[PDB]
Amino acid sequence: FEIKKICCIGAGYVGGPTCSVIAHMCPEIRVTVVDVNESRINAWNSPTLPIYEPGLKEVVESCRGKNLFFSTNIDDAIKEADLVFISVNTPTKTYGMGKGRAADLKYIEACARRIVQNSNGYKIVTEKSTPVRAAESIRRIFDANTKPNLNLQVLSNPEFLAEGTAIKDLKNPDRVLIGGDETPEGQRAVQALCAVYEHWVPREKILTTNTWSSELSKLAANAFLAQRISSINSISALCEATGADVEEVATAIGMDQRIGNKFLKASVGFGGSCFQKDVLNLVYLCEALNLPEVARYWQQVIDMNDYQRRRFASRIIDSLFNTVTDKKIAILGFAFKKDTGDTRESSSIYISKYLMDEGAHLHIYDPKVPREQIVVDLSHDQVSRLVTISKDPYEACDGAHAVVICTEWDMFKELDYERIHKKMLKPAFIFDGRRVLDGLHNELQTIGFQIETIGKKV
Amino acid sequence: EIKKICCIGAGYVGGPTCSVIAHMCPEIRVTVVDVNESRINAWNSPTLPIYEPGLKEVVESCRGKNLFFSTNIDDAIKEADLVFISVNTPTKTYGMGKGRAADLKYIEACARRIVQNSNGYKIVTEKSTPVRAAESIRRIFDANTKPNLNLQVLSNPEFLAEGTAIKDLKNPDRVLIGGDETPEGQRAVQALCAVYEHWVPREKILTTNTWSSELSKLAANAFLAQRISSINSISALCEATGADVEEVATAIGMDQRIGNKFLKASVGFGGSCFQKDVLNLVYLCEALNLPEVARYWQQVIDMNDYQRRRFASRIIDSLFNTVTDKKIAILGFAFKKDTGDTRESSSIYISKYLMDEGAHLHIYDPKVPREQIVVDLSHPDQVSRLVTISKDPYEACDGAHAVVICTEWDMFKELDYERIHKKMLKPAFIFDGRRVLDGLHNELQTIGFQIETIGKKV
Amino acid sequence: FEIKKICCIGAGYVGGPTCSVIAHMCPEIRVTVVDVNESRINAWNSPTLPIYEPGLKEVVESCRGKNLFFSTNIDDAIKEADLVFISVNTPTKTYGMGKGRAADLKYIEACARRIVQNSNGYKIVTEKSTPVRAAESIRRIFDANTKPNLNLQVLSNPEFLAEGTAIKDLKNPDRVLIGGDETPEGQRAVQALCAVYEHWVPREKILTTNTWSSELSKLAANAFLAQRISSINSISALCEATGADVEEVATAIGMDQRIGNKFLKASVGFGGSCFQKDVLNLVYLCEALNLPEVARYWQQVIDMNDYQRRRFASRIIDSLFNTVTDKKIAILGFAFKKDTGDTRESSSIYISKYLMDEGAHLHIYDPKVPREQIVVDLSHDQVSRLVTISKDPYEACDGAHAVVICTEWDMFKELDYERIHKKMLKPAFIFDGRRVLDGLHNELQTIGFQIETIGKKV
């Protein structure tokens, strides 16, 4: 009927911030986040949260201990909950079928079973990572382990938040998506969860589908975004060959309202822990379902990304006459995008890897990524021989043959380039992988730099 | 200051654009010229050779005052400040790039005509904007200089859609103008801007180099085509998993970074713009040794081709792989609703696949003339033996095994399907290739139909 | 309950001989064979039957007009029948999907519909050509066109007879196979048809399966037989390369009772209208069902057959120094196997075709095949220029460079080879494609022949 108590299994990004927001917006609902990881739970109950998000500390502390609880007691929280969120990791498989592409359902299934063991009467169970087949899997387990007077409803409610802006995104979503059965039972359940979201979210922005659609939506959304980036990246190679300019072309394209102007910035390649993972998973799913045409269609988004990184590296190596042994090269930017410390699937790792294959002496600078993270990312002895992590950008550039800008940190616009030039070996190259130095081209060339950028003919 | 305009080419590009300019700039003399005398006479008649809503009023508003249609090319060039080249760029039919490359023969001949008839300073602006057009005109001008002859070459693509040409010309999303990044080019661009600023706000006017304006027109259409192919690829996936493509497209679309336009799954995209532009883009990548980029874009075409085939082969399979002497209704022949245009219509391809099976097709479309349906299906006896063009949908469905909906005409929503069912052979099939019958499935299933549709599992 | 009246739709090999035997063995049953082809029906009612089979004329005439009837009145025969056989042609598709491989269900479906229109109360309907999906197709049609008090049961009862021995095979079958639903209705029906066969056939030899199994059995049986031939043919190529002898190897193989000694005679290639058609159909079915591994497995049976014919032809052409223009060559045997006039998929057609490609003057002899059939088989002007049909074998060999034995007619063993040699050009070649001349090798070599055979090293 009404949702008064909520259990969230999983205290990560998927479930921590969401349930904190729910308990901040609905004073009447007892929200209990549970996790087997004790050190994670103690961090949520500390004055410093295990997740860095703007305004998150304030949201939690305004209701923690009131109607928001972080507990290591999973069993009991399930027992007394009207609604159980499942938001646990779904890491990519590391061995077996779909190795490196398919998602691993083991934690979802283990949570599904713990729910049965600890559960009585009516409950609504909503999965939040939403890989394809999660809901089907949870359904199979519930149906095969029933009890008298046990009625578990299964729903799907994917998270669309982006890290860095989790709270704004949670308070002001483009849409909320809930999936459930096209049954009179399933309808009863979708309504219940809707009523929770309607505390801060208009009904206009709440969309109800079937469980399969919510699963495929999350995946497809991220695939379309990634496609946009590879599309404009493919154009960038064509601009380099013709004398067109990818920033002019992208702006022209974006002013068509049927297309819109977002996700059209050409780059050395997309990164982050969402896009490649989701496109690879989509490809796997199509192969497994005997849809090879659709699989090869989506594979191109990955192949284009790979090609964009390789041709960038290759252009650097060719400018150096195909010899980079013992030459110092500055890598400016290691984060996968600016204004974050996240390096997952960062394009800098890949470019670095290519230059290390050439025996380059890499001096790497990034204002936010820790030295420890960079070392681990490049390793898998080569790192010890070839990689220096520079304290400052000038240190990285001192006596370098080339400067390679890999991340679009704003500070790179405003470095003293005349000084950098003096201390570089000649010819001094600047390779701009992010169009971050647009407008400075005439000045850099008169300073003496050979300056090159994605999507611009030499 | 531009006060005299000559437009070579009285087609879809030149006619409407120059009529609008003249209707917005009383002070500018605008002369549309063409060698084809009968066309010119038609522009000077009460029956223009182009049917666009609003066009007759625009023409008659200023024709004779400051808008003129003439067969005298030479005197129109001689006097003009600005010369638009608005001639056809047909796809090559033989030779290198047969079926994919644009043929620049008319653009070159105009460039040669312009030099023959010009002295002093003139701006020449290419409007069809195929890739290399600007370079071509520039090569003819540069090799044929006269003392005191200073021609500037600009590129200015049209973005109108037939049916809303006037609305798109009076309120464009953007105006694109390409020119050299030089003082000459800048001056020439400025002059053309000043013309458009009589009715177009300066924020919506974008200036670029001439390569960018060419690439932009090609790229925009490719991006649009790619979106439809992406959503069609999702539709196959939905059919295999139990997701619904409309649900999914609506979820994807409410992401403000993706936008909700061009996300409707269909039997395949059609029209004179998309396949042509993507094919030309593929061709240009091969020629520029960008095979990676060529196969990336080729996928947009292959996915379109795959979506049509799997739709057809689903019809053929449901009829146990024999359609010989079987009556099949085809509802809709235009490439989309509300038009009589059949170019690259999916109906053509579906009809073609069923004809290879010896199907007796009965085709109904409320706007496409019977001679256009016949001529499209005759392209390289089969049409003679197998095809009937019906005058009402009920004559087409009388005694048919299957009803194929290929074009999203609204009237198909509202037919008497109880009536149709009774007169169909059993089992009676409806294959809905446009999702036109969504919401009605339970009505039709209980009437007795086997009803199938794109992006919905059976 | 009991079967007293039987209607057979189709008066060919499938239904003519079977129903004649049924009416000869069951005096109590009224058997009525019907066909739209009037000239076929009048032939069955004449003293000379349209089908040549040993003892067939006697079987028909002992009961024709008593309890066996051949009628052009399809409609009425259906009305009064307890049991309706469907045994009409299922020709390979000539256009569309599965062209040249898939079977065409059009006549089965047309018979299914005529049955509904003309049928009341309870009837059992048994299809006898049994291509895959036939029964499913008939079932779909019956279910979609029901009436009050209409109960049609669908069964499958494939024919295994071989032409030439139809009657012996019908009176003494290895097995009878009937397929029907695993329902209490389907069981009722299978029993009824069993009781008919039990008039001359022991219950031990009557096998009951599901409708899908009977369909796949017919196909798979013929595929296994064809596989056996290609297997021993593959070995024959290996014997030629090693010095083993394929007749020794085949005999050794066959004496393993787990293998048995049938269908192990190596040849130039299998033929007849059953094997290639059934293997091609099996391959198509696997492709259509997304079983590409199984498809390529079975394709090898066809590829091996093709390879065996080609390498045989190629050996002839190489022995002639790759020039056969205007050289006379005797083709002895045109029938696909000995003791018949049937040339369907005969290996002689293929070998002939290869030599005609070389501009050979073919003199063709066969004791049973008509001249008219040979001409039609080789045609599709080349035949007029290059092909002579010889009255006698000696005429064929007179002034020939080579003698090619393509069919295993016994008479070829006993020709006067010393005479043939005298009249041949030298070197005189004999190419034995059937091991028909085994044991004569020493004599032919001392006569002066260069004699070669399948599966024997030079």
mmCIF file of N, CA and C in Angstrom, chain B residues 5-15 17-18 31-34 73 77 80 82-89 103-115 123-130 133-134 136-138 140-141 151-158 192 196 214:
data_model
loop_
_atom_site.group_PDB
_atom_site.id
_atom_site.type_symbol
_atom_site.label_atom_id
_atom_site.label_comp_id
_atom_site.label_asym_id
_atom_site.label_seq_id
_atom_site.Cartn_x
_atom_site.Cartn_y
_atom_site.Cartn_z
ATOM 1 N N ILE B 5 22.108 40.667 -57.312
ATOM 2 C CA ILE B 5 22.341 39.251 -57.118
ATOM 3 C C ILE B 5 21.912 38.449 -58.339
ATOM 4 N N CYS B 6 22.774 37.526 -58.764
ATOM 5 C CA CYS B 6 22.427 36.610 -59.833
ATOM 6 C C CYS B 6 22.467 35.198 -59.311
ATOM 7 N N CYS B 7 21.400 34.457 -59.564
ATOM 8 C CA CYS B 7 21.347 33.057 -59.172
ATOM 9 C C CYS B 7 21.229 32.107 -60.357
ATOM 10 N N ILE B 8 22.308 31.387 -60.647
ATOM 11 C CA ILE B 8 22.320 30.411 -61.732
ATOM 12 C C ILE B 8 21.751 29.078 -61.250
ATOM 13 N N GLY B 9 20.546 28.764 -61.722
ATOM 14 C CA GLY B 9 19.853 27.559 -61.310
ATOM 15 C C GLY B 9 18.500 27.887 -60.716
ATOM 16 N N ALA B 10 17.445 27.524 -61.420
ATOM 17 C CA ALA B 10 16.106 27.856 -60.970
ATOM 18 C C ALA B 10 15.409 26.632 -60.397
ATOM 19 N N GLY B 11 16.143 25.841 -59.659
ATOM 20 C CA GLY B 11 15.624 24.666 -59.011
ATOM 21 C C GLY B 11 15.161 24.897 -57.602
ATOM 22 N N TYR B 12 15.104 23.822 -56.853
ATOM 23 C CA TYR B 12 14.715 23.864 -55.472
ATOM 24 C C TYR B 12 15.647 24.687 -54.632
ATOM 25 N N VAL B 13 16.939 24.605 -54.859
ATOM 26 C CA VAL B 13 17.847 25.438 -54.106
ATOM 27 C C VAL B 13 17.804 26.929 -54.391
ATOM 28 N N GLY B 14 17.874 27.299 -55.652
ATOM 29 C CA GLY B 14 17.970 28.682 -56.080
ATOM 30 C C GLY B 14 16.674 29.455 -56.073
ATOM 31 N N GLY B 15 15.625 28.854 -56.620
ATOM 32 C CA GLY B 15 14.325 29.499 -56.710
ATOM 33 C C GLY B 15 13.785 30.079 -55.414
ATOM 34 N N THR B 17 15.126 30.187 -52.231
ATOM 35 C CA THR B 17 16.081 31.000 -51.475
ATOM 36 C C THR B 17 16.142 32.445 -51.973
ATOM 37 N N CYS B 18 16.202 32.600 -53.289
ATOM 38 C CA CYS B 18 16.329 33.915 -53.898
ATOM 39 C C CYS B 18 15.018 34.687 -53.905
ATOM 40 N N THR B 31 18.180 38.320 -59.637
ATOM 41 C CA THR B 31 17.859 37.680 -60.912
ATOM 42 C C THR B 31 18.171 36.159 -60.932
ATOM 43 N N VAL B 32 17.110 35.360 -60.988
ATOM 44 C CA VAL B 32 17.248 33.919 -61.049
ATOM 45 C C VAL B 32 17.351 33.507 -62.513
ATOM 46 N N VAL B 33 18.466 32.897 -62.902
ATOM 47 C CA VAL B 33 18.612 32.493 -64.309
ATOM 48 C C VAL B 33 18.761 30.981 -64.500
ATOM 49 N N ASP B 34 18.258 30.500 -65.632
ATOM 50 C CA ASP B 34 18.391 29.101 -66.031
ATOM 51 C C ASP B 34 18.344 29.023 -67.559
ATOM 52 N N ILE B 73 21.589 34.386 -69.044
ATOM 53 C CA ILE B 73 22.605 34.155 -68.030
ATOM 54 C C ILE B 73 23.682 35.221 -68.109
ATOM 55 N N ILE B 77 25.066 37.721 -65.054
ATOM 56 C CA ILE B 77 26.379 37.582 -64.429
ATOM 57 C C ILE B 77 27.170 38.885 -64.496
ATOM 58 N N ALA B 80 26.057 41.422 -61.921
ATOM 59 C CA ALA B 80 25.888 41.010 -60.528
ATOM 60 C C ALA B 80 27.056 41.342 -59.601
ATOM 61 N N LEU B 82 26.925 39.656 -56.608
ATOM 62 C CA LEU B 82 27.002 38.345 -56.012
ATOM 63 C C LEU B 82 26.395 37.332 -56.977
ATOM 64 N N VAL B 83 27.088 36.214 -57.189
ATOM 65 C CA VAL B 83 26.566 35.149 -58.023
ATOM 66 C C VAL B 83 26.434 33.850 -57.241
ATOM 67 N N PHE B 84 25.195 33.384 -57.108
ATOM 68 C CA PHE B 84 24.906 32.080 -56.541
ATOM 69 C C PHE B 84 24.980 31.037 -57.645
ATOM 70 N N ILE B 85 25.646 29.929 -57.348
ATOM 71 C CA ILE B 85 25.617 28.757 -58.215
ATOM 72 C C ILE B 85 24.735 27.722 -57.530
ATOM 73 N N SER B 86 23.585 27.438 -58.145
ATOM 74 C CA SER B 86 22.569 26.553 -57.573
ATOM 75 C C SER B 86 22.153 25.468 -58.548
ATOM 76 N N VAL B 87 23.138 24.757 -59.074
ATOM 77 C CA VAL B 87 22.888 23.729 -60.078
ATOM 78 C C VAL B 87 22.914 22.326 -59.472
ATOM 79 N N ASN B 88 22.354 21.376 -60.208
ATOM 80 C CA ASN B 88 22.284 19.996 -59.743
ATOM 81 C C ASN B 88 23.648 19.339 -59.609
ATOM 82 N N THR B 89 23.807 18.545 -58.560
ATOM 83 C CA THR B 89 25.008 17.747 -58.406
ATOM 84 C C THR B 89 24.584 16.278 -58.349
ATOM 85 N N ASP B 103 28.803 14.356 -58.884
ATOM 86 C CA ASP B 103 29.344 14.763 -60.180
ATOM 87 C C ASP B 103 29.350 16.300 -60.277
ATOM 88 N N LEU B 104 30.546 16.877 -60.407
ATOM 89 C CA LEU B 104 30.768 18.319 -60.344
ATOM 90 C C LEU B 104 30.702 19.053 -61.695
ATOM 91 N N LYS B 105 30.207 18.373 -62.732
ATOM 92 C CA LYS B 105 30.259 18.895 -64.093
ATOM 93 C C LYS B 105 29.490 20.200 -64.296
ATOM 94 N N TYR B 106 28.326 20.340 -63.674
ATOM 95 C CA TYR B 106 27.552 21.571 -63.823
ATOM 96 C C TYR B 106 28.153 22.743 -63.046
ATOM 97 N N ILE B 107 28.760 22.449 -61.893
ATOM 98 C CA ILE B 107 29.431 23.488 -61.117
ATOM 99 C C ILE B 107 30.625 24.061 -61.884
ATOM 100 N N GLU B 108 31.428 23.178 -62.468
ATOM 101 C CA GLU B 108 32.561 23.607 -63.286
ATOM 102 C C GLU B 108 32.144 24.464 -64.486
ATOM 103 N N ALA B 109 31.077 24.054 -65.160
ATOM 104 C CA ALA B 109 30.626 24.757 -66.352
ATOM 105 C C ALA B 109 30.121 26.152 -65.982
ATOM 106 N N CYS B 110 29.513 26.266 -64.810
ATOM 107 C CA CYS B 110 29.084 27.572 -64.324
ATOM 108 C C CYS B 110 30.281 28.437 -63.972
ATOM 109 N N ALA B 111 31.274 27.847 -63.310
ATOM 110 C CA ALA B 111 32.505 28.562 -63.002
ATOM 111 C C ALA B 111 33.165 29.118 -64.267
ATOM 112 N N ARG B 112 33.157 28.329 -65.343
ATOM 113 C CA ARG B 112 33.710 28.775 -66.618
ATOM 114 C C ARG B 112 32.847 29.850 -67.256
ATOM 115 N N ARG B 113 31.530 29.712 -67.152
ATOM 116 C CA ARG B 113 30.641 30.741 -67.673
ATOM 117 C C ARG B 113 30.840 32.081 -66.936
ATOM 118 N N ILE B 114 31.009 32.015 -65.616
ATOM 119 C CA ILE B 114 31.171 33.215 -64.801
ATOM 120 C C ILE B 114 32.434 33.994 -65.187
ATOM 121 N N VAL B 115 33.565 33.301 -65.297
ATOM 122 C CA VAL B 115 34.783 33.959 -65.767
ATOM 123 C C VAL B 115 34.605 34.592 -67.146
ATOM 124 N N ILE B 123 31.551 38.351 -55.785
ATOM 125 C CA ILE B 123 31.520 37.221 -54.884
ATOM 126 C C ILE B 123 30.712 36.123 -55.559
ATOM 127 N N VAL B 124 31.269 34.915 -55.586
ATOM 128 C CA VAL B 124 30.599 33.739 -56.129
ATOM 129 C C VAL B 124 30.392 32.727 -55.009
ATOM 130 N N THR B 125 29.142 32.320 -54.823
ATOM 131 C CA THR B 125 28.765 31.466 -53.715
ATOM 132 C C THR B 125 28.112 30.189 -54.212
ATOM 133 N N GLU B 126 28.760 29.066 -53.931
ATOM 134 C CA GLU B 126 28.227 27.731 -54.216
ATOM 135 C C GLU B 126 27.176 27.359 -53.182
ATOM 136 N N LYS B 127 26.000 26.920 -53.645
ATOM 137 C CA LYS B 127 24.873 26.561 -52.764
ATOM 138 C C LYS B 127 24.568 25.055 -52.579
ATOM 139 N N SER B 128 24.915 24.203 -53.550
ATOM 140 C CA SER B 128 24.709 22.746 -53.407
ATOM 141 C C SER B 128 25.712 22.140 -52.435
ATOM 142 N N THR B 129 26.892 22.745 -52.403
ATOM 143 C CA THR B 129 27.976 22.390 -51.493
ATOM 144 C C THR B 129 28.363 20.916 -51.425
ATOM 145 N N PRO B 130 28.577 20.258 -52.589
ATOM 146 C CA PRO B 130 29.222 18.935 -52.457
ATOM 147 C C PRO B 130 30.692 19.144 -52.125
ATOM 148 N N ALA B 133 33.604 21.274 -54.142
ATOM 149 C CA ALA B 133 33.006 22.237 -55.079
ATOM 150 C C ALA B 133 33.780 23.551 -55.035
ATOM 151 N N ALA B 134 33.981 24.065 -53.830
ATOM 152 C CA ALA B 134 34.714 25.312 -53.623
ATOM 153 C C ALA B 134 36.126 25.249 -54.205
ATOM 154 N N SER B 136 37.134 23.365 -56.562
ATOM 155 C CA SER B 136 37.003 23.282 -58.006
ATOM 156 C C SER B 136 36.838 24.649 -58.679
ATOM 157 N N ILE B 137 35.903 25.436 -58.150
ATOM 158 C CA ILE B 137 35.604 26.759 -58.668
ATOM 159 C C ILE B 137 36.864 27.628 -58.542
ATOM 160 N N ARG B 138 37.550 27.482 -57.417
ATOM 161 C CA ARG B 138 38.766 28.225 -57.143
ATOM 162 C C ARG B 138 39.863 27.868 -58.149
ATOM 163 N N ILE B 140 39.378 26.838 -61.317
ATOM 164 C CA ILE B 140 38.990 27.400 -62.609
ATOM 165 C C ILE B 140 39.220 28.911 -62.644
ATOM 166 N N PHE B 141 38.864 29.591 -61.552
ATOM 167 C CA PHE B 141 39.095 31.039 -61.444
ATOM 168 C C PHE B 141 40.585 31.355 -61.458
ATOM 169 N N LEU B 151 37.615 37.541 -58.183
ATOM 170 C CA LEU B 151 36.475 36.724 -57.767
ATOM 171 C C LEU B 151 36.701 36.082 -56.409
ATOM 172 N N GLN B 152 35.721 36.202 -55.522
ATOM 173 C CA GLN B 152 35.810 35.544 -54.229
ATOM 174 C C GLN B 152 34.871 34.346 -54.211
ATOM 175 N N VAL B 153 35.338 33.233 -53.656
ATOM 176 C CA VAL B 153 34.543 32.018 -53.661
ATOM 177 C C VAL B 153 34.014 31.736 -52.274
ATOM 178 N N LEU B 154 32.699 31.704 -52.143
ATOM 179 C CA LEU B 154 32.097 31.371 -50.860
ATOM 180 C C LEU B 154 31.264 30.103 -50.974
ATOM 181 N N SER B 155 31.002 29.494 -49.826
ATOM 182 C CA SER B 155 30.161 28.324 -49.748
ATOM 183 C C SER B 155 29.024 28.618 -48.759
ATOM 184 N N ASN B 156 27.787 28.327 -49.162
ATOM 185 C CA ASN B 156 26.603 28.640 -48.360
ATOM 186 C C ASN B 156 25.504 27.605 -48.566
ATOM 187 N N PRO B 157 25.567 26.496 -47.812
ATOM 188 C CA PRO B 157 24.657 25.365 -48.027
ATOM 189 C C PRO B 157 23.223 25.654 -47.652
ATOM 190 N N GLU B 158 22.274 25.065 -48.365
ATOM 191 C CA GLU B 158 20.887 25.154 -47.942
ATOM 192 C C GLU B 158 20.512 23.994 -47.020
ATOM 193 N N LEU B 192 28.068 38.918 -47.380
ATOM 194 C CA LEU B 192 26.958 37.970 -47.473
ATOM 195 C C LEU B 192 26.150 37.947 -46.168
ATOM 196 N N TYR B 196 21.939 38.516 -45.241
ATOM 197 C CA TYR B 196 21.075 37.683 -44.408
ATOM 198 C C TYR B 196 20.544 38.399 -43.164
ATOM 199 N N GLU B 214 31.136 22.654 -46.414
ATOM 200 C CA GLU B 214 30.852 21.447 -47.201
ATOM 201 C C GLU B 214 30.702 20.206 -46.316
#
